[PDB]
């Protein structure tokens, strides 16, 4: 449904403290439950954070950040908000908004292929 | 379900054919998705359940394999291809390969 992901600036974080990386959707039709979080630490693959699940309507995260991870949106502004807190050195990475693909089928622990991808946030922490 | 991609670098010349491998830990049947990510930017979605290619996607660029064993083949290897590719299944929820470096030498 060609949309574009639009990030905010990169940020250098010290220790123990939290980031909140935005993300605004322009184009066809904004829903919080196909934009979904991830991010890629440098020399590895991209990694799944988190979403805001549909009928539930509440936001889920993986393991890895839960206790830590916020997610929110505000369709109104057609915005998703990150907030990844207690920061490690570990957490230096880019992190993405995608949003996702729908499958002809949805089934038992079955996910998603991302389409379009914002730009990227490095998160830098000291 | 673990994605192990292969080769770590492919080093190819301008018109050569590029053979990525995607080795699935479980079986994922066609749920594969083929990514190119161009240095400092997002990845671009190349082959979806396996085969299918992407929206604006040259032939060049095609995706093979089901359950475990996976190929991405980049024929006619162009200068602008030179990225690092992932994997990524849908099967067992979300999860990407390591990467494969393309250089273009």
């Known amino acids: 449904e060609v949309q574009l992901l639009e990030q905010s600036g990169a940020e250098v974080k010290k220790p123990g403290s939290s980031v909140k990386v935005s993300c605004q959707v322009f184009?066809?039709?904004?829903?919080?439950?196909?934009i979904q979080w991830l991010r890629q630490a440098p020399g590895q693959g991209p990694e799944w954070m988190g979403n805001?699940?549909?009928?539930?309507?509440?936001?889920n995260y993986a393991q890895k950040f839960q206790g830590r991870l916020s997610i929110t949106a505000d369709d109104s502004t057609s915005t998703a908000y990150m907030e990844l807190s207690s920061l490690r050195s570990e957490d230096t990475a880019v992190y993405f908004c995608?949003?996702?693909?729908?499958?002809?089928?949805?089934?038992?622990?079955?996910?998603?292929?991302?389409?379009?991808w914002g730009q990227g946030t490095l998160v830098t922490v000291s | 379900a673990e994605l192990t991609q292969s080769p770590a670098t492919l080093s190819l010349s301008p018109g050569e054919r590029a053979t990525l491998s995607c080795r699935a830990s479980?079986?994922?049947?066609?749920?594969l998705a083929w990514y190119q990510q161009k240095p400092g930017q997002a990845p671009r979605l190349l082959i979806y359940?396996?085969?299918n290619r992407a929206t604006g996607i040259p032939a060049r660029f095609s995706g093979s394999g089901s359950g475990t064993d996976f190929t991405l083949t980049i024929s006619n290897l162009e200068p602008e291809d030179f990225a690092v590719y992932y994997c990524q299944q849908r099967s067992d929820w979300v999860t990407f390969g390591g990467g494969t470096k393309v250089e273009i030498k």
């Open positions: 805001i699940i549909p009928v539930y309507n509440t936001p």
């Open positions: 479980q079986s994922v049947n066609k749920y």
């Open positions: 184009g066809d039709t904004f829903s919080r439950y196909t």
């Open positions: 359940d396996a085969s």
């Open positions: 995608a949003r996702v693909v729908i499958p002809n089928a949805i089934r038992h622990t079955m996910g998603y292929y991302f389409d379009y």
